[PDB]
């Protein structure tokens, strides 16, 4: 009877969007690196 939460419920919507975007950015950059 204990339901999980995220910080979306407790932090400003803007701060959330930042890491949301950061994550999308990160998944796209998964490959290929020099020397």
């Amino acid at each position: 009877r204990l339901k999980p939460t995220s910080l979306d419920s407790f932090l400003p919507e803007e701060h959330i969007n930042y890491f949301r975007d950061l994550r999308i950015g990160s998944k796209k950059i998964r490959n290929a690196k020099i020397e």
Partner: protein, 247 residues
């Protein structure tokens, strides 16, 4: 652009690994005072906040405040290949890459591609916490370890004169109680009675870097996130914000 140097790469690697066992990417903002890394796990259940002040760096040169964005799995696989006391160099040019150079014996360099990210706002807007607990790492670690045998959540209760960690499973129950008379509780400040609960798997990861003698600071509120702060390996401050389990 910037260049930073730290003696002892694998120390720095281990520093980073500890701060990042819950996450996949982070934004590092470089200012004059030092580096501030901010991150969230993809489920957005934990916020991670790391400070590295100028002081801990051999050379530390930063023109303007800048923020980069890094795939942390990428970064770690590079830092992995760091000798025990090679000197670590991190050069940033105008191109969106980071130059990771390890010097000593054999000098090698790598180029890590960054993630388009805007400037990090460094802050943690004052959540209305009603309870502050300060306690030794040994105690906090053993509380979570013990609870984990029995449940996958743990309940925190702070009253005026006792702090309690509570875990209930199908098999048995375990509890840790502290009062100010115990060596393991340094401070207890309770503006009103405060109860909340958290996932063990998250907590377990958060406490790994903590050493048995370190003071840990806990701040939380009723059915509210837990904030947990401590000093890591004599370098800087690690601060977690963890979402609660509710109802």
């Amino acid at each position: 652009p910037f260049e930073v140097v730290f003696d002892g790469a694998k120390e720095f690697a281990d520093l980073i690994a500890t701060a990042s066992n819950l996450i996949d990417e982070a934004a590092f903002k470089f200012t004059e005072e030092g580096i501030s890394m901010r991150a969230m796990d993809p489920s957005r259940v934990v916020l991670i906040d790391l400070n590295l002040p100028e002081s801990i760096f051999s050379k530390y040169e930063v023109e303007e405040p800048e923020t980069i964005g890094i795939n942390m799995d990428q970064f770690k696989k590079i830092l992995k290949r760091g000798k025990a006391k090679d000197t670590l160099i991190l050069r940033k040019g105008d191109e969106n890459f980071l130059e990771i150079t390890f010097e000593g014996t054999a000098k090698r360099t790598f180029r890590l591609p960054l993630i388009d990210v805007e400037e990090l706002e460094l802050e943690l807007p004052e959540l209305p916490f009603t309870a502050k607990v300060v306690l030794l790492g040994e105690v906090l670690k053993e509380g979570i370890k013990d609870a984990s045998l029995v449940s996958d959540a743990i309940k925190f209760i702070a009253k005026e004169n006792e702090f309690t960690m509570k875990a209930e499973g199908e098999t048995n129950e375990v509890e840790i109680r502290l009062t100010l008379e115990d060596e393991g509780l340094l401070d207890l400040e309770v503006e009103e009675e405060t109860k909340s609960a958290y996932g063990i798997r998250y907590l377990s990861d958060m406490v790994k870097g903590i050493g048995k003698a370190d003071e840990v600071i806990l701040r939380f509120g009723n059915e509210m996130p837990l904030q947990m702060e401590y000093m890591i390996r004599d370098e800087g401050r690690l601060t977690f914000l963890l979402a609660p389990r509710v109802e």
